[PDB]
């Protein structure tokens, strides 16, 4: 039946109805009205009700006024989408995607549902824009409006990535987050479609906390399940699986980490980076790439979550020192040591503080000495890290060719420190076997 | 063949009405309508090594009578093959990368992809002499040797509906590498062990 | 975006457009026969843009540089 297969593909690819029963069914598919009423409704009744809904939506938010001129127009009562050309259809698709990104925040409200019902019953968005409509209803997958949209969706018009929804169309129940997350770990296409929808919204600054929390939660659980799948024990397969995970993730996180204007999606990308650095055993250069981009990316609004994710990233590294620009922007951080004590009450900041002290000591600048002194007297490092940091400081003092005055002032303050850090510093002096009084009287004379 | 040809003949290139043979340090050019010898291009160098024509010569599509040769030094020299005249030279960026390993015309107009032995792939306007993209595409031990662009019109951008895909391979490996050239030129996949 | 090098031979070259059947399709009017090399290359560029239009990549961040660096995907 190759002819029946070719004709089945033609009938599935066809878009306009060609017999009266097909026109009546396609006109009967609605969100609000039952089918027995929605068959016998002209486009003046639908436009009156749904324009009352759009008047309420346009009085709520200001930015619906171009759609007042182009989508919800009295002339747009009459336009048939299947009679315009391909470029008119593509521009109408752009206008519809912009309205759906705009209306996704208020979609629990009956004005916004009336506006989406106008788009569905006039422009047939459930058939021609199934991707954007299904993606903008996906963060509301626990509501009866999503159940009704799932009821009126055509089956073969859904994209391949959203074909987990077929049992929930056969039995009209809302799909659970376990089903969405499990299909996100199995298919990279569904995770890429959700992340592409929310990043395309957040570039147009039409974000809302429901969408941001939705994407952050599903990418966090999807990266969790994806790491638990990618783990193999064989060396070359786990190398290739880490590379495939990074190639599937990298654009999304590389944009959502440095999206400065949207701190919610920035914090959600920090959450995904923290999961990726803790659970997945990655490499040191990948973790320095993540830290350098976070350091380039933070604001004042995400500074303390950025520092938490930075503590996790620096903790799960095998190398001991940080790569420059990380230490430069953490110099630019306002209250470093007090914030690190507030984090170290719950998060073990020791390797970050050790790498910070080493990367400051590797600078020959002398505007880092209050930060070095505070990080040493902080009680954040361990005894061995404090000892090797002070040894590197005295070695830098021996390597310098003023500078030595501030160096000796810092060294005499660190030697005359009070507690266990001062005990370990004087013990480090005793095991490097070099006298205090030489450089003491050399700087005092 | 000319009488004083004592070199192996590395590649052939037919365009216009001219067939062009890059031998090793020498280009012999015939006219194809009559299959007759026309002239001989002699690139020159100051050092002994830098004269060697590794890589090859390629034509750009809308460029009249011009071959683009790569040298053992980092230079890509444009040669007008009608009058046999060196018309421009374009220098390698960051000159630590030493030898032109290959070069291929993009589907964009007057943009050439030069691949150096030190690692970088550059794509450059060859009349503006201005670098469009710079990509650290190879290890210094594994130089990029063959590059080819997808002239389909789609295949990039994490959705598959955007163009700009380039495959590349080194001779020391057996894996090809696909780049999406859109944002900055990221990598999108590596097909591993395509051959032994 | 001024062109760096200029050819002196394309001024001198001339090409009949109505003679060849392949070059027949790239004339403007039903009068253009003999065309200099610069205008010939211009029509040839227009026809290449007709066959394959200019893609949108032909018109930094640490993680993006990490992704576009191919020394990171080693085995």
């Amino acid at each position: 039946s190759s002819l029946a297969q070719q004709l089945a593909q033609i009938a599935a690819n066809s878009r306009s109805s060609f017999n009266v029963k097909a026109l009546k069914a396609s006109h009967s598919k609605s969100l609000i009205w039952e089918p027995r009423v929605a068959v016998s409704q002209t486009f003046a009744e639908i436009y009156s009700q749904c324009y009352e809904g759009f008047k309420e939506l346009c009085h709520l938010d200001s930015r619906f006024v171009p759609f007042d001129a182009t989508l919800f127009s009295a002339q747009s009562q009459e336009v048939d989408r299947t009679q315009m050309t391909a470029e008119e259809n593509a521009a109408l698709d752009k206008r519809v995607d912009s309205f759906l990104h705009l209306v996704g925040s208020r979609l629990r409200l009956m004005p916004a549902i009336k506006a989406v019902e106008w788009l569905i019953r006039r422009f047939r968005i459930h058939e021609f824009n199934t991707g954007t409509l299904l993606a903008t209803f996906l963060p509301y997958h626990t509501i009866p409006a999503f159940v009704t949209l799932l009821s009126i969706l055509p089956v073969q018009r859904i994209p391949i990535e959203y074909r987990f929804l077929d049992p929930y169309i056969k039995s009209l129940t809302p799909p659970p987050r376990a089903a969405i997350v499990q299909q996100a770990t199995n298919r990279p296409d569904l995770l890429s479609a959700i992340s592409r929808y929310t990043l395309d919204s957040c570039r147009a600054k039409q974000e809302y906390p429901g969408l941001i929390s939705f994407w952050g939660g599903i990418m966090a659980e999807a990266v969790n399940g994806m790491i638990d799948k990618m783990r193999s024990g064989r060396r070359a397969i786990q190398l290739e699986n880490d590379h495939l995970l990074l190639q599937q993730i990298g654009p999304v996180l590389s944009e959502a980490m440095v999206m400065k204007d949207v701190p919610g999606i920035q914090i959600a990308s920090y959450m995904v980076v923290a999961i990726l650095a803790a659970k997945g055993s990655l490499n040191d250069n990948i973790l320095t790439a993540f830290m350098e981009q976070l350091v380039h990316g933070w604001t004042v609004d995400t500074l303390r979550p950025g520092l938490v994710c930075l503590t996790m990233l620096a903790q799960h590294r095998s190398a001991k020192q940080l790569s420059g620009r990380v230490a430069k922007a953490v110099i630019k951080v306002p209250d470093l040591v007090s914030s690190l004590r507030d984090i170290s009450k719950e998060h073990q900041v020791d390797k970050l503080a050790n790498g910070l002290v080493l990367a400051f000591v590797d600078r020959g600048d002398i505007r880092t000495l209050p930060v070095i002194n505070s990080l040493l007297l902080s009680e954040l490092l361990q005894e061995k890290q404090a000892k090797v940091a002070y040894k590197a400081l005295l070695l830098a003092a021996h390597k310098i060719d003023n500078i030595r005055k501030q160096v000796g002032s810092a060294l005499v303050r660190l030697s005359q420190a009070e507690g266990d850090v001062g005990d370990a510093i004087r013990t480090a002096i005793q095991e490097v076997d070099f006298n205090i009084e030489e450089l003491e009287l050399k700087l005092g004379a | 063949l000319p009488s004083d040809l004592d070199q192996p003949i590395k590649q052939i290139l037919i365009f216009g009405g001219w067939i062009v043979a890059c031998a090793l340090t020498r280009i012999e050019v015939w006219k194809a309508a009559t299959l007759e010898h026309y002239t001989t291009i002699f690139p020159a160098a100051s050092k002994k090594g830098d004269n060697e024509l590794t890589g090859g010569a390629i034509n750009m599509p809308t460029f009249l009578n011009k071959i683009f040769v790569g040298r053992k030094d980092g230079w890509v020299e444009i040669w007008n093959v009608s009058t046999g005249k060196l018309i421009y030279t374009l220098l390698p960026p960051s000159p630590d990368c030493g030898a032109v390993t290959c070069l291929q015309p993009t589907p964009a107009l007057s943009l050439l992809a030069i691949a150096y032995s030190g690692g970088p792939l550059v794509i450059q306007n060859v009349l503006t002499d201005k670098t469009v993209l710079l990509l650290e595409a190879g290890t210094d031990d594994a130089p990029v040797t063959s590059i080819s662009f997808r002239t389909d019109g789609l295949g990039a951008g994490q959705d598959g509906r955007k163009d700009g895909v380039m495959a590349t391979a080194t001779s020391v490996s057996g894996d090809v590498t696909f780049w999406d050239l859109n944002k900055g030129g990221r990598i999108m996949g590596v097909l591993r062990s395509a051959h032994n | 975006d001024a062109p760096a090098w200029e050819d002196s031979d394309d001024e001198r070259l001339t090409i009949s457009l109505a003679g060849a059947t392949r070059l027949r399709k790239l004339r403007i009017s039903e009068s253009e026969d003999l065309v200099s090399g610069i205008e010939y290359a211009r029509r040839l560029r227009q026809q290449y843009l007709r066959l394959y239009p200019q893609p949108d990549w032909a018109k930094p961040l640490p993680l993006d540089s990490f992704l576009r660096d191919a020394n990171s995907f080693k085995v």
Partner: peptide, 22 residues
């Protein structure tokens, strides 16, 4: 099932003939 590849057919593509760069 969806996501399965179809048969291979050579797509007709117009190429720039390079015999006219002369």
């Amino acid at each position: 099932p969806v996501g399965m590849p179809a048969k291979w057919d050579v797509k007709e593509a117009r190429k720039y003939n390079i015999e006219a760069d002369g």
